[PDB]
Enzyme design. Structure first.
Site, PDB file in Angstrom:
ATOM      1  N   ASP A  36       0.884  -1.157   0.000  1.00  0.00           N
ATOM      2  CA  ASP A  36       0.000   0.000   0.000  1.00  0.00           C
ATOM      3  C   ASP A  36       0.916   1.199   0.000  1.00  0.00           C
ATOM      4  O   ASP A  36       1.305   1.714   1.038  1.00  0.00           O
ATOM      5  CB  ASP A  36      -1.002  -0.013   1.149  1.00  0.00           C
ATOM      6  CG  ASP A  36      -0.356   0.077   2.475  1.00  0.00           C
ATOM      7  OD1 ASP A  36       0.648  -0.635   2.696  1.00  0.00           O
ATOM      8  OD2 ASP A  36      -0.865   0.862   3.308  1.00  0.00           O
ATOM      9  N   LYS A  91     -12.366  -3.541  -1.791  1.00  0.00           N
ATOM     10  CA  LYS A  91     -13.408  -4.385  -1.155  1.00  0.00           C
ATOM     11  C   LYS A  91     -14.729  -4.312  -1.903  1.00  0.00           C
ATOM     12  O   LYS A  91     -15.549  -3.412  -1.659  1.00  0.00           O
ATOM     13  CB  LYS A  91     -13.597  -3.971   0.289  1.00  0.00           C
ATOM     14  CG  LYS A  91     -12.358  -4.057   1.121  1.00  0.00           C
ATOM     15  CD  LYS A  91     -11.947  -5.483   1.379  1.00  0.00           C
ATOM     16  CE  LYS A  91     -10.790  -5.506   2.339  1.00  0.00           C
ATOM     17  NZ  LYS A  91      -9.509  -5.658   1.650  1.00  0.00           N
ATOM     18  N   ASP A  94     -21.124  -4.236  -2.799  1.00  0.00           N
ATOM     19  CA  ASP A  94     -22.358  -3.615  -3.228  1.00  0.00           C
ATOM     20  C   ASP A  94     -23.292  -4.685  -3.814  1.00  0.00           C
ATOM     21  O   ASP A  94     -22.947  -5.879  -3.927  1.00  0.00           O
ATOM     22  CB  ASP A  94     -22.020  -2.586  -4.327  1.00  0.00           C
ATOM     23  CG  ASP A  94     -22.699  -1.269  -4.126  1.00  0.00           C
ATOM     24  OD1 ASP A  94     -23.878  -1.250  -3.654  1.00  0.00           O
ATOM     25  OD2 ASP A  94     -22.043  -0.245  -4.446  1.00  0.00           O
ATOM     26  N   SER A 149      -9.355  -9.488  10.586  1.00  0.00           N
ATOM     27  CA  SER A 149      -8.321  -9.474  11.658  1.00  0.00           C
ATOM     28  C   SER A 149      -8.540  -8.415  12.728  1.00  0.00           C
ATOM     29  O   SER A 149      -7.823  -8.407  13.736  1.00  0.00           O
ATOM     30  CB  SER A 149      -6.919  -9.268  11.062  1.00  0.00           C
ATOM     31  OG  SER A 149      -6.878  -8.086  10.274  1.00  0.00           O
TER      32      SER A 149
END
Ligand SMILES: O=C(O)c1cc(=O)[nH]c(=O)n1[C@@H]1O[C@H](COP(=O)(O)O)[C@@H](O)[C@H]1O
Ligand SMILES: O=C(O)c1cc(=O)[nH]c(=O)n1[C@@H]1O[C@H](COP(=O)(O)O)[C@@H](O)[C@H]1O
Lengths: 255, 257
Positions: A36, A91, A94, A149
């Protein structure tokens, strides 16, 4: 318990899962790097240097300040050279009609470069049927988020069971889970586990860590996903190798 | 007591973003949110201009916009200020806290720079709200939590929905309401926004289920309807928006008394 190499040959195995399981056995790595980073140059540098050590690279296109489809063309070349899959973090969560466009379209065109995507099961099975419409023609795979997590996760109990049933009933597209442990008894499915560090601890925003030994060895997962454990290290090459060696040995031991 | 939107705008614990919304709702007689899942900026901007006076909010889908630039968002902001609606990005923030803060602030889209409202799934635990809040608080942004969903097989039920309500109530400096199929909170400071709405009975082939404006606002106690295809598929999108606006507005007036 079957080896990764044997699992890659299972009759019901998905192609993307097979390709992954093969390269995992070949390279002796069940380590997925979470990258990231905000610059394309950083992403590409990390992928080239750590590529040998990983089975998979988890991208975060939504935070790359200089994303272009050319960067992804270049990433894919690295992927093909070092042999690792590309798993985008977005993620999908929808209704089916909307996720379809999110997966195929826009500036990112995720389906055109991501071997794997992940979806939350909260919307019900329409989330997968929608993704499938785009994913199957492009020969892609999907991971369902069965557990998380982080502190206060609601992905527990019946929610987790619902995830497992969804996966098993959409096995032409779903190849596995994001989870903290083995949640399916079918060896055709992959288990990928985030929230992994060598040391005990967490972060200041709900993350909780367990070790490679715990997650692969005791909890029966297949792959560790590690971000900061590697990226924040002084020597990232050395870090990636420590995590690879940890996860690989935990796997061998389980065998 | 049921209160008008104008009254709710003045509630002691009301968020500045919610108050701005509630006041323009009252002024313009609209509790309609257009969901504009279009792939071209010209269509988005033309829709925002023509339907702007009829809507209280515009739900954007930046992930689907093939020619996104920040300059398109600049022009949208102009139209939002002119016609008086809030901008609500559809992106489902649904990761751990550390990760969602970067997704909200950064990348090419810089969603926090132009969206009044964002939504989050509550499945990661309250970290997801804390992360977003670290970015959105100073910008006077607000967050909606997804407490229920309109699709078949939704897991946002029971204890999950209750967890959503509790999370909002415990982070009311930043969470301004819910995506829900009905009133889930008794606290009038919170907005209820409901998708899965069309004038006609039906659904789609990928799990969507529809109910009418009358049902969702009048019987189920929601505040705002979210409508995409019901308006977007019409030949005349302005006429369609006006129909949805009058339906939702009268339904609200009915329960007001
Ligand atoms: O999709 C995931 O892997 C995800 C879900 C989850 O339950 N936990 C979790 O940590 N993640 C992601 O996995 C990565 C973990 O990174 P570190 O905590 O930096 O190792 C981040 O990208 C998280 O957003
Ligand atoms: O985020 C949402 O609003 C979402 C949640 C939900 O439970 N149901 C739902 O329909 N939506 C969104 O609301 C809009 C509904 O579109 P139509 O079905 O075309 O009215 C789409 O943007 C959906 O992705």
């Amino acid at each position: 318990e079957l080896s990764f190499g044997a699992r890659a040959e299972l009759p019901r195995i998905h192609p993307v899962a097979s390709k992954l399981l093969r390269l995992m056995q070949k390279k002796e790595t069940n380590l997925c790097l979470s990258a990231d980073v905000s610059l394309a140059r950083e992403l590409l540098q990390l992928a080239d240097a750590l590529g040998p050590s990983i089975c998979m690279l988890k991208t975060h296109v939504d935070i790359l300040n200089d994303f272009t489809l050319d960067v992804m063309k270049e990433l894919i070349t690295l992927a093909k050279c070092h042999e690792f899959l590309i798993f985008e973090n977005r993620k999908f969560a929808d209704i089916g009609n909307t996720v379809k466009k999110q997966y195929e379209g826009g500036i990112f065109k995720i389906a055109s470069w991501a071997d794997l995507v992940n979806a939350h099961v909260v919307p019900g099975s329409g989330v997968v049927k929608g993704l499938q419409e785009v994913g199957l023609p492009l020969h892609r795979g999907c991971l369902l988020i069965a557990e998380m997590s982080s502190t206060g996760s609601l992905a527990t109990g019946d929610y987790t069971r619902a995830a497992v049933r969804m996966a098993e009933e959409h096995s032409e597209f779903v190849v596995g889970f994001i989870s903290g442990s083995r949640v399916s008894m079918k060896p055709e499915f992959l288990h990928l586990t985030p929230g992994v560090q060598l040391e005990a601890g967490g972060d200041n925003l709900g993350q909780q860590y367990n070790s490679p030994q715990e997650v692969i060895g005791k909890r029966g997962s297949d792959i560790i996903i590690v971000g900061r454990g590697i990226i924040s290290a002084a020597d990232r090459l050395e870090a990636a190798e420590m995590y690879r060696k940890a996860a690989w040995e935990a796997y061998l031991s389980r065998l």
